[PDB]
Ligand binder design. Structure first.
Ligand SMILES: *[C@@H]1O[C@H](CO)[C@@H](O)[C@H](O)[C@H]1NC(C)=O
Ligand SMILES: *[C@@H]1O[C@H](CO)[C@@H](O)[C@H](O)[C@H]1NC(C)=O
Ligand SMILES: *[C@@H]1O[C@H](CO)[C@@H](O)[C@H](O)[C@H]1NC(C)=O
Ligand SMILES: *[C@@H]1O[C@H](CO)[C@@H](O)[C@H](O)[C@H]1NC(C)=O
Ligand SMILES: [K+]
Ligand SMILES: [K+]
Ligand SMILES: [K+]
Ligand SMILES: [K+]
Ligand SMILES: [K+]
Lengths: 270, 270
């Protein structure tokens, strides 16, 4: 009954966390939401007044443009989707469960194949992230044991892997690595995309956490400088960042499980 | 080469080949539809320009304004207010579950900082919740088989649970439960939203696999019938479906790890 108690405690804590985050986000951005909607209403009113346009025909034109935007075409020189380069980035967002929504299937067969393709690839890439976390554990353990061996040799003048890093040490290493990759990717995105550095950090966290809002997406607009190299760099940075942030999520999940066990042990005593 | 390193490299190569093949087939399936939709959009824009006597630059500026509005949450057909507490709850649910449809995206500098700091803990806690749900599903299935064995022994006569179900049985149970949950959620979404049943199934897979394209989002348009019941039912179905598909991804990841071990044993033998 200790595992059921831990499950119920985690569910209650997550529900309370959801409520608190909803309240904080509402308090933070309801004013911005209202101001942006008011600015859009003012712009639409000026557009209708200046050019003598009815609201119904403008609404129909906006419906047509929404249908166009769902098809991938945008205002300012976005790359053509569903070519081999664009479909590769779409597949990278599908299989890594990022799913920006920059590229969505419209055919019936495309969505069926997306269902099967996700069912296989997303599982294989969850396995890939777990294997990457295990290899990072092994690499950190090997580095620590090699440093210990070098220290022993300097003083003197099978499975192995006896030394294992603590979960706090792995959290620190993964946090530092993710911060470094986010900073490097943002330093590449800022002069190329024109984003603010904080906007690039936010996009890096969103993509690396497999959240993928799609409000900011890296390589969508066309006519890049060194387009072949930039696409590869974006793919590699996104891959390492998603790996590191998902591994950090697993490590923090282990730590939160330990915290829940400690909380249950506190209430078990009295 | 190490056994784990060889498995890691083999999985990376298999995933890269999978991405290449999926990109090729997705391009082949969707490029014609994308070209047709872009041609339709260009025809509609030309009709709007030549009918209402509107310059291309002025329409481009108006569409830029509409894009800035849609980024806030403006849609052409009566969607719910954004960043209200009910909407912020949906957004936070999409954040912590790593779904991230993008119906509601932060634009405030403080909002995105809070998204990063909040979503770290939220996504880690929710991945831990998925792992705990999978473990509890294992325990429940094992308890069901134990109860069936006790019932058949009592009829024939007239912690334990060491015996755990095989990964094949868990895969079958999870995919059956996932199909049932997706069918129930789609049967809910089809009359409420007006989506096709296949479109509702596709949205169910996208939401439940935490891919979250955002092309289809469930409770966005306003003025539902019994909003409090529908929003709660949508949240419950999304939670259970995401848990089932994420646990299914974990189980298929275990299966693919076993297959990779078998392949490596095949190469090790000769
Ligand atoms: C819209 O309303 C009037 C029209 O000239 C103007 O004063 C106002 O600044 C306009 N706002 C925008 C955003 O165009
Ligand atoms: C606006 O367009 C309508 C439709 O042609 C017309 O009846 C009306 O007179 C126009 N208003 C102007 C030009 O102020
Ligand atoms: C839109 O443009 C196409 C291309 O000329 C034309 O065939 C069609 O009739 C137009 N539609 C309307 C409603 O004018
Ligand atoms: C609209 O029609 C008038 C006709 O007098 C013309 O002078 C003008 O260039 C056209 N275009 C715009 C954007 O006003
Ligand atoms: K995800
Ligand atoms: K995930
Ligand atoms: K996602
Ligand atoms: K997404
Ligand atoms: K999205």
């Amino acid at each position: 009954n200790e595992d059921n108690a831990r499950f119920l405690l985690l569910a209650a804590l997550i529900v309370l966390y959801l409520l608190g985050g909803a309240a904080v986000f509402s308090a933070l951005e309801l004013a911005h939401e209202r101001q942006a909607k008011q600015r859009w209403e003012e712009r639409l009113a000026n557009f209708s007044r200046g050019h003598n346009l009815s609201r119904d025909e403008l609404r129909g034109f906006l419906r047509h443009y929404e249908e166009a935007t769902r098809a991938g075409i945008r205002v300012d020189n976005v790359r053509p989707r569903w070519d081999f380069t664009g479909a590769f980035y779409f597949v990278g967002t599908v299989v890594s469960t990022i799913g920006f929504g920059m590229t969505t299937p419209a055919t019936v067969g495309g969505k069926i194949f997306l269902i099967f393709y996700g069912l296989v690839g997303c599982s294989s890439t969850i396995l890939f992230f777990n294997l990457f976390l295990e290899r990072l554990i092994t690499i950190i353990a090997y580095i620590m044991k090699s440093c210990h061996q070098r220290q022993l040799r300097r003083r003197g003048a099978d499975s192995l892997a006896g030394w294992k890093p603590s979960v706090y040490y792995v959290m620190l290493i993964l946090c530092t690595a993710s911060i470094l990759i986010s900073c490097c990717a943002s330093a590449m995105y800022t002069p190329i995309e024109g984003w603010s550095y904080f906007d690039s950090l936010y996009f890096c966290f969103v993509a690396f956490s497999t959240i993928g809002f799609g409000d900011l997406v890296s390589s969508q607009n066309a006519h890049y400088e060194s387009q072949g190299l930039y696409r590869f760099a974006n793919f590699v940075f996104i891959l390492m960042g998603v790996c590191c942030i998902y591994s950090l999520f697993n490590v923090i999940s282990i730590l939160i499980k330990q915290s829940l066990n400690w909380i249950l042990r506190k209430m078990d005593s009295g």
